[PDB]
Amino acid sequence: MEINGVEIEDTFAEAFEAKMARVLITAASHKWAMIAVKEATGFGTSVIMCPAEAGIDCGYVPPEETPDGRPGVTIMIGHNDEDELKEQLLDRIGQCVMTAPTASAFDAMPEAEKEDEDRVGYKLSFFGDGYQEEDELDGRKVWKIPVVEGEFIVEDSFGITTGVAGGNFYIMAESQPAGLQAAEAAVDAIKGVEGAYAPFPGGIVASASKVGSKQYDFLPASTNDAYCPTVEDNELPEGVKCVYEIVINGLNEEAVKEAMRVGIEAACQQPGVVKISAGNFGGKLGQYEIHLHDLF
Amino acid sequence: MEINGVEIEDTFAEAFEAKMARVLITAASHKWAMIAVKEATGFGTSVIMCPAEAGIDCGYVPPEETPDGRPGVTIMIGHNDEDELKEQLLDRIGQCVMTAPTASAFDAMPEAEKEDEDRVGYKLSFFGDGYQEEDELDGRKVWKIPVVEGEFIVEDSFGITTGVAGGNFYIMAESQPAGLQAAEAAVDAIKGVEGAYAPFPGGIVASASKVGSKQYDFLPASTNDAYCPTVEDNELPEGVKCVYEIVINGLNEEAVKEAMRVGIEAACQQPGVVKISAGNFGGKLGQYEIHLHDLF
Amino acid sequence: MEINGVEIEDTFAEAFEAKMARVLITAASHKWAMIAVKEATGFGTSVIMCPAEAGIDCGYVPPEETPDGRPGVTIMIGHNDEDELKEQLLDRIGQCVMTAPTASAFDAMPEAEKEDEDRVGYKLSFFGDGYQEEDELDGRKVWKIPVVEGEFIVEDSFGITTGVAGGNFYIMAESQPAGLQAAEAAVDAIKGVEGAYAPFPGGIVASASKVGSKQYDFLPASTNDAYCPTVEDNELPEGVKCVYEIVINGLNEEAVKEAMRVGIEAACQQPGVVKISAGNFGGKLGQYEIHLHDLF
Amino acid sequence: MEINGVEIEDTFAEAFEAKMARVLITAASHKWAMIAVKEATGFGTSVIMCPAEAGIDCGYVPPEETPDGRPGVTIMIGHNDEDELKEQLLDRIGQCVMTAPTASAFDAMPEAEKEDEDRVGYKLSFFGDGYQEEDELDGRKVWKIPVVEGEFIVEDSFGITTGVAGGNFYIMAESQPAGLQAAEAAVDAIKGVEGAYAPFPGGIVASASKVGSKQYDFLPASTNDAYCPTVEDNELPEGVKCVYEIVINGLNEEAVKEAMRVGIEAACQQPGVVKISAGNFGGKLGQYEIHLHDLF
Ligand SMILES: [K+]
Ligand SMILES: [K+]
Ligand SMILES: [K+]
Ligand SMILES: [K+]
Ligand SMILES: [K+]
Ligand SMILES: [K+]
Ligand SMILES: [K+]
Ligand SMILES: [K+]
Ligand SMILES: [K+]
Ligand SMILES: [K+]
Ligand SMILES: [K+]
Ligand SMILES: [K+]
Ligand SMILES: [K+]
Ligand SMILES: [K+]
Ligand SMILES: [K+]
Ligand SMILES: [K+]
Ligand SMILES: [K+]
Ligand SMILES: [K+]
């Protein structure tokens, strides 16, 4: 199989069940919404050594579609453990969205995906020290928390789902610059797929990992040396000088599949791409297998 | 005292000793440098419920002044506890800079400020699983860690200092929009002060806090209700409808003082600003007191 | 009639027929597309003293919805004179898109709107000095022009329509900061409206004009003094200390009306707005009269 | 001569005398200054088919270094004809800066460079229709023009110099992605050089031209086929699959030389660059000849 002359390896991404929330942040403008967004979703590439996996879902929510009539952005926050996710919701919304100029936080978990709920707004409202007030806004139960700016509006409760984490594909390129141009094109495409996010910096992984380590016994993960171009005994095709990985989390398997589909399609339009692969664990770890040949 | 007709309150900011590191991130472009920067310094407004306090120091480092000849950006990461700071250095550089396309990480702690060092590069190099290599780059001891992209270059060791955390001033404004325009002008000014950063979203705090809670026994902090415009018994001057706080951390007291100085000066040039105040704890907590009247 | 407490004057915007083109710019990334876009649409606020009226229509076209599978952005270029429009298409695509890294230019004028044709890509093809080559791409007739980068891809011909120019509303606020916050929320809303653009800087006019001048016979336009808050005998409501205008052009009257509607609604959600008005010429001149009360 | 393994051709850039102005734009924030700047400097890559050659000089002027204590950005506008330059100053400031929210325009031409004066602010003052008012601001003679926002502040007069236009170098790389990564690093470097600007989109020319035409007697200029990688009979080194040009204008020859020097050095640190060249016209046309070997 080839897409625009680029080899698609007959392999699969191995992905996992993971708990996820989806939050709508609105603010006085898109600019201020993004300010809160970047802060709240930062230090959140991987649960290997980050507190969560977080990223932007929809970069632009029209003011006419938000509960308060203001510009919005949707983000997603995820973790393998639901209790840690609830902690991460409280911390990131309370430290990064409550503190952000003009930003409000509303639930954006689709009705069908909702399995559980965490009362993040209620838990945050105690910051008001007795002065907090419940109200209804556009049919939503919200807390109005007095802050020095005026008020912080946060929805009482946020829906939690079991989503899919670790959808992925590798871009194998003739050089680093060609690999990165291809990878950014992929991420631009993934931007448009609702319910999916790419937690790594710019959505791109420059340092893909393997489980554990061969030489050490204190490492949870180490470099995927099989795919390292400066490693003597690497398993890279000839003419492959750089590898990038795109890692995708989503509300469901279909959102991850779509993000993988449009990502690869976009990457294969860029020059100097040799082949597309995917990362898996030989079916021994995950709950999902997304086969590349099935997507096209 | 008035600056452009704006009242400067005769008070002080009460700030604290805190451990800090300063990192230079370079990348293929300013764009990719900033990608790594935003990820690495996110979820880091306040040690109240964030793992660290982090932010950009110098947004633009010319390529001719970096060890590798590439565009750079300097960031600062801080914490009240040195052991937690060392953990935060490993986590943020390893998860957010090592994974970021093209980015390298070099020490940027000034010689005079260096009190301690953490071998973050050495500790990260084990990710190479035996394939990592030490080298010298522009006089610096660096580790070349094989990654799927090619290599991750990180300096062996990073200097740690005892800096100053919690420098601050309040902008009291006739309205939220006037407060925010004044606050952003202040942050634009603080951008130019080397050795200082503002950890909050866009550098601005919309929800300033007080120690503990009046009504609850489980909260380490709650809203500063004295400065809340919607609270009935607030201590706000008449005509003050919004308050923002700017919180500043720095390598030393002088860097924080300068950031406070240029910030207030910039804020007072914007329309609708009623007065400037500062947050303190009546001298009972901090190691530093920066009096507003002393700055002008 | 009020929106969130903001008066909506029972008046109308008076708008005009204008010739318009619509161009899809694709590039290796959204970043490089925007680079071409900002260059090609700049120096194009008003035909009073700029060569054209130009701006971004759709900020994000997904890769899978473009002819070449690459990230896209749509722009619009307008002028009262069709011959001048054709010259502007040639100049802006030839000098600002052809020269921009990786950028291609395709027709994005809807079939139902097309009235005339301008063979821009045919005209630009001669730059190839004999080496240019016609081809077909996703059903479109394109020219592949050899350039030092590789090739410039440009559609043979672009459609021209009689659109609408000069749709508008005024935001009257309690202060400059309040007015600008409301105005940017409006522009955020207008972003989402396909086939409409706001040609002024950030979509906002800080210096609205009237036809001619009371004092100077060499001027085609001068300040709208009745709405200047510093002018002594102004016709501004008390409490209004700042006025902004949002000027909108579009493919048809419906796009203009829609941009006006969502822009006003978004503006009215922001604090410190007193009323909304609109600029007309007494209904004695324009082809279109858009009554504010008819929008809601 | 090699820089980082990259050949530096023993050739020269041939550049020309050109008339130039330099403008300081201040605004409520860096964001709004940038809004005005992009509008005012757009449609200004080349005087071949654009009305002027314009670009950002300094991206960040600190508030305390500006006449009004507000965030600033400096831009430059050039043209071979002084009368056309004066018209371009009037058109670009009057239509793109006067109209931009909160933006002011001050002279930023160093005294040592000043040759001529253009009373732009005086010429713009008539827009005030009698209500305009001269004042002094930070020792500068300015006009306060009443506008719907409040006031437009513009310096009475702007200095004009005979600068340098057409400084250049070519980046010859192994691929388009490699070329563009090198070219952007170059532009990042050129950003830091005061008194020099790169007028093309993102600073980069994707379609360098040659004088005249081989096939068409009616063309003044066409694609430099000698440097087109898709042209069969090109004069490109083997292994070169992409060429970019960086074009630089500046206040004097030293600024141009400096931008060339740091731009080349930055480019050469990026992977996949084969050689650096420069464009000239046989030493017959230009006033300046800038030899690449003389820079390092
Ligand atoms: K998405
Ligand atoms: K907030
Ligand atoms: K689900
Ligand atoms: K993230
Ligand atoms: K199939
Ligand atoms: K700083
Ligand atoms: K990296
Ligand atoms: K110190
Ligand atoms: K931060
Ligand atoms: K639009
Ligand atoms: K192009
Ligand atoms: K039409
Ligand atoms: K425009
Ligand atoms: K000047
Ligand atoms: K410069
Ligand atoms: K202005
Ligand atoms: K000169
Ligand atoms: K330009």
PDB file of all heavy atoms in Angstrom, chain D residues 167-178:
ATOM      1  N   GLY D 167      20.371  43.838  -0.728  1.00  0.00           N
ATOM      2  CA  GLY D 167      21.322  42.933  -0.105  1.00  0.00           C
ATOM      3  C   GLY D 167      20.662  41.571  -0.119  1.00  0.00           C
ATOM      4  O   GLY D 167      19.438  41.471   0.027  1.00  0.00           O
ATOM      5  N   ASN D 168      21.448  40.519  -0.327  1.00  0.00           N
ATOM      6  CA  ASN D 168      20.864  39.190  -0.485  1.00  0.00           C
ATOM      7  C   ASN D 168      21.840  38.040  -0.285  1.00  0.00           C
ATOM      8  O   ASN D 168      23.060  38.221  -0.334  1.00  0.00           O
ATOM      9  CB  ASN D 168      20.199  39.068  -1.865  1.00  0.00           C
ATOM     10  CG  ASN D 168      21.206  38.963  -2.991  1.00  0.00           C
ATOM     11  OD1 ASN D 168      21.779  37.895  -3.232  1.00  0.00           O
ATOM     12  ND2 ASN D 168      21.420  40.065  -3.699  1.00  0.00           N
ATOM     13  N   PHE D 169      21.283  36.859  -0.051  1.00  0.00           N
ATOM     14  CA  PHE D 169      22.021  35.619  -0.232  1.00  0.00           C
ATOM     15  C   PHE D 169      21.070  34.494  -0.623  1.00  0.00           C
ATOM     16  O   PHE D 169      19.867  34.575  -0.363  1.00  0.00           O
ATOM     17  CB  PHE D 169      22.902  35.278   0.991  1.00  0.00           C
ATOM     18  CG  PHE D 169      22.140  35.055   2.279  1.00  0.00           C
ATOM     19  CD1 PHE D 169      21.771  33.773   2.669  1.00  0.00           C
ATOM     20  CD2 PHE D 169      21.832  36.125   3.116  1.00  0.00           C
ATOM     21  CE1 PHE D 169      21.088  33.559   3.852  1.00  0.00           C
ATOM     22  CE2 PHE D 169      21.146  35.918   4.321  1.00  0.00           C
ATOM     23  CZ  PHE D 169      20.772  34.636   4.685  1.00  0.00           C
ATOM     24  N   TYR D 170      21.613  33.467  -1.279  1.00  0.00           N
ATOM     25  CA  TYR D 170      20.866  32.269  -1.621  1.00  0.00           C
ATOM     26  C   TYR D 170      21.256  31.131  -0.705  1.00  0.00           C
ATOM     27  O   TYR D 170      22.438  30.907  -0.459  1.00  0.00           O
ATOM     28  CB  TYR D 170      21.145  31.820  -3.056  1.00  0.00           C
ATOM     29  CG  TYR D 170      20.573  32.734  -4.117  1.00  0.00           C
ATOM     30  CD1 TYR D 170      21.395  33.605  -4.825  1.00  0.00           C
ATOM     31  CD2 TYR D 170      19.212  32.729  -4.410  1.00  0.00           C
ATOM     32  CE1 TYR D 170      20.876  34.456  -5.808  1.00  0.00           C
ATOM     33  CE2 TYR D 170      18.680  33.575  -5.398  1.00  0.00           C
ATOM     34  CZ  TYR D 170      19.518  34.437  -6.086  1.00  0.00           C
ATOM     35  OH  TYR D 170      19.005  35.274  -7.060  1.00  0.00           O
ATOM     36  N   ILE D 171      20.245  30.403  -0.248  1.00  0.00           N
ATOM     37  CA  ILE D 171      20.431  29.164   0.495  1.00  0.00           C
ATOM     38  C   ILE D 171      20.118  28.013  -0.447  1.00  0.00           C
ATOM     39  O   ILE D 171      18.990  27.881  -0.926  1.00  0.00           O
ATOM     40  CB  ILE D 171      19.504  29.092   1.731  1.00  0.00           C
ATOM     41  CG1 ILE D 171      19.785  30.266   2.667  1.00  0.00           C
ATOM     42  CG2 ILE D 171      19.658  27.743   2.463  1.00  0.00           C
ATOM     43  CD1 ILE D 171      18.666  30.526   3.658  1.00  0.00           C
ATOM     44  N   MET D 172      21.136  27.206  -0.725  1.00  0.00           N
ATOM     45  CA  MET D 172      21.000  26.043  -1.588  1.00  0.00           C
ATOM     46  C   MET D 172      21.024  24.788  -0.732  1.00  0.00           C
ATOM     47  O   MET D 172      22.036  24.474  -0.109  1.00  0.00           O
ATOM     48  CB  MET D 172      22.121  26.021  -2.634  1.00  0.00           C
ATOM     49  CG  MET D 172      22.163  27.273  -3.511  1.00  0.00           C
ATOM     50  SD  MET D 172      23.207  27.090  -4.972  1.00  0.00           S
ATOM     51  CE  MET D 172      22.890  28.648  -5.767  1.00  0.00           C
ATOM     52  N   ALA D 173      19.899  24.084  -0.693  1.00  0.00           N
ATOM     53  CA  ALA D 173      19.754  22.921   0.178  1.00  0.00           C
ATOM     54  C   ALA D 173      19.405  21.640  -0.571  1.00  0.00           C
ATOM     55  O   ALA D 173      19.035  21.667  -1.754  1.00  0.00           O
ATOM     56  CB  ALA D 173      18.728  23.205   1.264  1.00  0.00           C
ATOM     57  N   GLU D 174      19.518  20.525   0.144  1.00  0.00           N
ATOM     58  CA  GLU D 174      19.259  19.189  -0.389  1.00  0.00           C
ATOM     59  C   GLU D 174      17.770  18.914  -0.649  1.00  0.00           C
ATOM     60  O   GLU D 174      17.425  17.975  -1.370  1.00  0.00           O
ATOM     61  CB  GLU D 174      19.818  18.128   0.567  1.00  0.00           C
ATOM     62  CG  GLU D 174      19.051  18.052   1.901  1.00  0.00           C
ATOM     63  CD  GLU D 174      19.553  16.957   2.826  1.00  0.00           C
ATOM     64  OE1 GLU D 174      20.742  16.576   2.720  1.00  0.00           O
ATOM     65  OE2 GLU D 174      18.754  16.490   3.669  1.00  0.00           O
ATOM     66  N   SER D 175      16.900  19.729  -0.053  1.00  0.00           N
ATOM     67  CA  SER D 175      15.454  19.586  -0.204  1.00  0.00           C
ATOM     68  C   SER D 175      14.764  20.897   0.162  1.00  0.00           C
ATOM     69  O   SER D 175      15.383  21.787   0.758  1.00  0.00           O
ATOM     70  CB  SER D 175      14.916  18.449   0.676  1.00  0.00           C
ATOM     71  OG  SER D 175      14.991  18.770   2.056  1.00  0.00           O
ATOM     72  N   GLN D 176      13.492  21.014  -0.222  1.00  0.00           N
ATOM     73  CA  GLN D 176      12.673  22.169   0.142  1.00  0.00           C
ATOM     74  C   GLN D 176      12.515  22.301   1.661  1.00  0.00           C
ATOM     75  O   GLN D 176      12.791  23.368   2.198  1.00  0.00           O
ATOM     76  CB  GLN D 176      11.321  22.156  -0.598  1.00  0.00           C
ATOM     77  CG  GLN D 176      10.350  23.267  -0.195  1.00  0.00           C
ATOM     78  CD  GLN D 176       9.531  22.909   1.037  1.00  0.00           C
ATOM     79  OE1 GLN D 176       8.843  21.891   1.069  1.00  0.00           O
ATOM     80  NE2 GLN D 176       9.581  23.757   2.039  1.00  0.00           N
ATOM     81  N   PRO D 177      12.101  21.223   2.363  1.00  0.00           N
ATOM     82  CA  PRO D 177      12.042  21.353   3.820  1.00  0.00           C
ATOM     83  C   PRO D 177      13.345  21.825   4.475  1.00  0.00           C
ATOM     84  O   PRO D 177      13.293  22.653   5.388  1.00  0.00           O
ATOM     85  CB  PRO D 177      11.676  19.936   4.282  1.00  0.00           C
ATOM     86  CG  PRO D 177      10.888  19.390   3.137  1.00  0.00           C
ATOM     87  CD  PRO D 177      11.657  19.880   1.935  1.00  0.00           C
ATOM     88  N   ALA D 178      14.489  21.313   4.015  1.00  0.00           N
ATOM     89  CA  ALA D 178      15.793  21.682   4.577  1.00  0.00           C
ATOM     90  C   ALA D 178      16.101  23.150   4.301  1.00  0.00           C
ATOM     91  O   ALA D 178      16.605  23.869   5.166  1.00  0.00           O
ATOM     92  CB  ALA D 178      16.905  20.785   4.033  1.00  0.00           C
TER      93      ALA D 178
END
